[PDB]
């Protein structure tokens, strides 16, 4: 096509084009005001319309990379505001585009966004909806400059739907606030997930990424042949490498080309792609990544024929070790969508270690005859953990389950800050809430999706502020051994009980006026501090103190005089608690 800008406008549509141009500029000019960005979008949009009317109009034949760079270099305050970045304007393309990619700021030093009152939000949405939504699209994009632009737009459309339905309801807040809390949690997870994959591609390697992909794609597309899975995996690895380099237009085109191939080869891939493949180009790649797993071929044979019995195991392996191990992973994963990818990789590393030892031993066939038995323990450990934890959750409920986790983790690593302990424990209790609702066959995959991001954030915080070598060890082990390591941590036998401090256990009536959330965190912060002072306390002993405290609040929160109840009846609860322990 002669005009890329015209081709994108016609393909995306005016509304979507204007929103993506706003996000693109906001992620590079993170310190320019919203009104400045609106003017840029309108200037690029009117030029695009000139090219849609006549593709041979001036500058309509230029690259979108050249047009983006030219506009960035027209900003008059560029040097004074961004310094080094302005020096990219002295370079020619393609060196200027690479220079801009290298000078984007990951940490904008900006104040946190404060959720306004519902009525203020709903009044703003009504009087000027586009302004309200684009202002917040700008605020988020400047704060998250590496978040894939098309996905941020998909979240904005979700936010629009929440405000449209809730701002005209009877209890707006009861409708909207639970939705904004869900969208925020989903957005933070996607950001962390996007950055984690790129950091993994560099730390663990391309071979490692490809094993992960073979396993996941064989679970989603079980009827596809190994060679189609191997093709999609080779292509998916190229898209991830480009996307992780940072260029949005290059990432979007690679992703779209792969979507086009998948949709032109559905009969050779999956029966669940019909609707994703009818959707517009902007949403096709996203839809495919969320597609449900296809049913597997009804009768599939045992894996022992080709992987244990056949006399040609060591021969087929030596011919191409990674192809053979990939075929094993493909065959095991297609049959086990109920497993985590990391479990399937543990089973693959066990077969590889076994073949490496037995294929060079006096008698190989006998040496590896019982390999499938080495897989049973690896499968039951994660399976039992899921059942045990999902059972304890059902008997307790989210908050109490979170509190059961709090005591467990505080005793395992008591050096961790009380705030870090409370958040991690609350987050993990949420994974259990959501995943334990899914059925047994989707629980382990659910847990992996969320634990991957919960644990890496924990390991990121620990790198910055290290406190335990045992956490460092688990955080610096093979990613296949990360969760098993954390789960194997035992109660710290070396920790010295923290010294008592009355204030930490001093409570006021301000608690009765707090939200459920703020009140839960206050109590949980105190439970952490209790276990830190009395780490040898038994579950019978702690339940007693917790039962006594609970009875204290309800009472002093119901007493004609409260400020005194909390003070007097609180000096007794503490002294009796100290004695029981
Ligand atoms: O396979 C793993 O090791 C895994 F990471 O954890 C786990 F199995 F889900 C688990 F063990 F944490 C539990 F408790 F949730 F089962 C997951 F999530 F990848 F499966
Ligand atoms: O695996 C564990 O021991 C772990 F505690 O997670 C967990 F137990 F699986 C869980 F409780 F978070 C749940 F809900 F997923 F089951 C942790 F911290 F190691 F990941
Ligand atoms: C990501 C695109 C968002 C555009 C619309 C956002 C509207 C919600 C504003 C209030 C949310 C503030 C952040 C929060 O939920 O804590
Ligand atoms: C695309 C087909 C072959 C490419 C990838 C197959 C590699 C086999 C993985 C065996 C090692 C698993 C452990 C790991 O890398 O994390
Ligand atoms: C000059 C500003 C250019 C901004 C245009 C950005 C276009 C990105 C949208 C590409 C469509 C998404 C493709 C995909 O992810 O499958
Ligand atoms: C060493 C003296 C400790 C003071 C006693 C108060 C400790 C209770 C804090 C945790 C309460 C648990 C909350 C709950 O069960 O709902
Ligand atoms: Br910490």
Numbering used by the authors: 3 to 583
Paper text:
A key aspect to be clarified, to address the adverse health effects associated with the exposure to PFASs, is their binding mode to human serum albumin (hSA), the most abundant protein in plasma. Indeed, the average half-life values for serum elimination of legacy PFASs, such as PFOA and PFOS, in environmentally exposed human populations are estimated to be in the order of 1–5 years, depending on the type of compound. Such long persistence and accumulation of long-chain PFASs in circulation have been ascribed to their ability to bind human serum albumin (hSA), the most abundant protein in plasma with a maximum circulatory half-life of 19 days in humans. hSA can bind a large diversity of PFASs, shielding their hydrophobic character and strongly enhancing their absorption and distribution throughout the body ultimately leading to relatively high blood concentration. In this study, we investigated the interaction between hSA and two representative branched short-chain PFASs, namely, HPFO-DA and C6O4. In-solution studies revealed that both compounds bind hSA with affinities and stoichiometries lower than that of the legacy long-chain perfluoroalkyl compound PFOA.
To better resemble the physiological conditions, cocrystallization trials were performed in the presence of a representative fatty acid, the myristic acid (Myr). A total of six distinct binding sites, two occupied by HPFO-DA and four by Myr, have been identified. The electronic density of bound HPFO-DA ligands was clearly visible allowing a definite assignment of the positions and orientations of both hydrophilic carboxylate head groups and fluorinated lipophilic tails. Both HPFO-DA molecules (herein named HPFO-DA1 and HPFO-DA2) occupy the long and narrow Sudlow’s drug-binding site II that span between FA3 and F4 sites, both located in subdomain IIIA. HPFO-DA1 is lying into the FA3 site while HPFO-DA2 lodges the F4 site. The carboxylate head-group of HPFO-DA1 forms hydrogen bonds with the side chain of Ser342, Arg348, and Arg485 residues. The rest of the fluorinated tail accommodates in the hydrophobic tunnel and establishes nonpolar contacts with surrounding Ser342, Val344, Arg348, Pro384, Leu387, Ile388, Met446, Ala449, Glu450, Leu453, and Arg485 residues. The hydrophilic carboxylate head-group of HPFO-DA2 is instead engaged in a hydrogen bond with the side chain of Ser489, while numerous polar interactions are established between fluorine atoms (F6, F12, F14, F15, F16, F18, and F19) and the oxygen and nitrogen atoms of both main and side chains of nearby Asn391, Tyr411, Leu430, Phe488, and Ser489 residues. Indeed, while the hSA-HPFO-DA-Myr complex revealed the presence of two HPFO-DA molecules bound to FA3 (HPFO-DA1) and F4 (HPFO-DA2) sites, respectively, the hSA-PFOA-Myr complex identified a single PFOA molecule located in the FA4 site and a Myr one into the FA3 pocket.
